[PDB]
Amino acid sequence: GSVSVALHPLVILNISDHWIRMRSQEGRPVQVIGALIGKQEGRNIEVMNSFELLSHTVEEKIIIDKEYYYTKEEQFKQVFKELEFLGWYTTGGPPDPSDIHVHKQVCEIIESPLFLKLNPMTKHTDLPVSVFESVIDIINGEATMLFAELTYTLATEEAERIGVDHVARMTATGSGENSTVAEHLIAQHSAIKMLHSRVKLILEYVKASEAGEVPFNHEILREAYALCHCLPVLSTDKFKTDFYDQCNDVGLMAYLGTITKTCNTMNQFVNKFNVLYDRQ
Amino acid sequence: MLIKVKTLTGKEIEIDIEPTDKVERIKERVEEKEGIPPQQQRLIYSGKQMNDEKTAADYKILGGSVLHLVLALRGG
Amino acid sequence: TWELANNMQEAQSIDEIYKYDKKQQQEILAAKPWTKDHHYFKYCKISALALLKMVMHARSGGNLAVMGLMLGKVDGETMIIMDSFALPVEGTETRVNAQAAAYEYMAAYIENAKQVGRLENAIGWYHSHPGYGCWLSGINVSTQMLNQQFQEPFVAVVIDPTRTISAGKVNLGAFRTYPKGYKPIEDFGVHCKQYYALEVSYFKSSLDRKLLELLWNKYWVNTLSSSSLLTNADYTTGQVFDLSEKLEQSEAQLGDKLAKATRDSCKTTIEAIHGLMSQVIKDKLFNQINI
DSSP states (O other), X not given: OOOEEEXXXXXXXXXXXXXXXXXXXXXXXXXXXXXXEEEEETTEEEEEEOOOOOEEEETTEEXXXXXXHHHHHHHTTTTOSSOEEEEEEEXXXXXOHHHHHHHHHHHHHSSSOEEXXXXXXXXXXXXXXXXXXXXXXXXXXXXXXXXXXXXXXOXXXXXXXXXXXXXXXXTTTTTTTOOHHHXXXXXXXXXXXXXXXXXXXXXXXXXXXXXXXXXXXTTHHHHHHHHHTTOSOOOSHHHHHHHHHXXXXXXXXXXXXXXHHHHHHHXXXXXXXXXXXXXX | OOEEEEOSSSOEEXXXXXXXXXXXXXXXXXXXXXXXXXTOEEEESSSSBOOSSSXXXXXXXXXXXXXXXXXXXXXX | OOSTTOOSSOOOHHHHTSSOOHHHHHHHHHHOGGGSXXXXXXXXXXXXXXXXXXXXXXXXHTTSOOXXXXXXXXXXXXXXXXXXXXXXXXXOTTOBOOOHXXXXXXXXXXXXXXXXXXXXXXXXXXXXXXXXXXXXXXXXXXXXXXXXXXXXXXXXXXXXXXXXXHHSSOOOEEEOBOOTTOOOOOTTOSOTTTBOOOXXXXXXXXXXXXXXXXXXXSOHHHHTTOOTTSSSHHHHHHHHHXXXXXXXXXXXXXXXXXXXXXXXXXXXHHHHHHHHHHHXXXXXXXXXXXX
């Protein structure tokens, strides 16, 4: 089915940085246009990096100029050798005909370009980005460029996970008055909700099989029974003793640490008291 | 005669050069004004490093195009 | 409602740091506060995007050594960096020389960024050390000498790709240097008196935070099966030891540091209680079903 798209957690950060930069510079958020670069291996397409392309406006329409891309194409060839043009990204919602018009000269530059959509105004659990492939229609007349939606993967190299965890541990939670609770108790809440959704789907399938909407597949129900019988995990005495020991240890570690915040407030109080009601 | 030099950090230099002056001469003057070492300047003119041997002969310019200076920066 | 605050368009000081106050930058540059005292900026804050770009450049270098620039600004006592930009330099894994290619590359890339809409300037440079820790060598010390003495706002960055890959944590090291004349541990090298170290911090925007949290959301199994405080025991014990040393120093001083000690203790206690809370939540969710 067409080509397999390999998306990396580096293009998205570039788009977000560009969007926030323009939003802060102009005050009123505007549309941003860039590019996508990577590798073509047979029927597989992978995206490595992304650099912005200058775009001009004429009347009300947007035009991608060729000279700036020509000058910038050989510039980054020095650092990245086996890197070639793939497509471009932009910010927006649904595919408007302006997208088709702007994609016309992209198809002129490269026969079959890819398309990336990032929607900062998303209110859904799905990935805000979307990958589209260009299709040329055969019907006579105005041959509109058709966007075929494909599947995007999350292929990553060795250093991606460690970097994202390192940056996401802090997130400057203690400077924006966002409360560390509102981060910790919320980050895993989404995972718990996802597990709830999966269990609900399994229960719905089991109920449908019981009623008779779906055929009696006498293989999935065995796995469902096995999953059912494995719910009370590790109800032994050793686990309970270890858990209680852990709880007591964390309680003591919190006591040593509350006892010093109280002491610091104590010190500040005596420092302020030694100036107001007592001379020197 | 009124050339401008802009560096990547923000320093702006205004220099006066006779059109038939040598490249070593212009480096010597710009080191006099700022304090560049005598042999460690890279000079860039319109996206092209100025060749030391090639003396400046035709400066058909009144402002606009500016030579940016950069220091040798290397590590090991 | 479930997330309460959410975000349509509102932000806070986290998103405010991404801007360019021309008048403020001009007046801090003109005033030159750090030219009067040696013990100026000690806090360096670098954005995520620059970090990943540096890491990918170092990895693409492989066993050899790479080298590139960085972009940002300075704000009061702190330094801000938010862009990485690689260079096409080659050489043996023990020495790299910037030929004319890099000289024609940095200016061209700066002009291209200015055409794009970028407004920041060069702030420093990053060099990858393949294996031999993170410390400035003699030639690095001389280069930093000349750079910080000619181009006063500057900072060097040294990372270790091999050790970062093997261990699992990054080896980011941000260094400024004491100028010549001011004279007033074998890991740091032999020029430990000439150069010193700085703390590192990171930031990300509201949009970046939302995107990172939503991307990391596809990690639920590890999220609810990690069982932290059992993997970072050594880190917490080291933190408590440093807490004890800081408390002793503060007590000696009383005979301020007490505020710093209180903040560190609060951070460690918050981490411990967060681990306990996650463990309790897991126990409630899994071990209290079907009797």
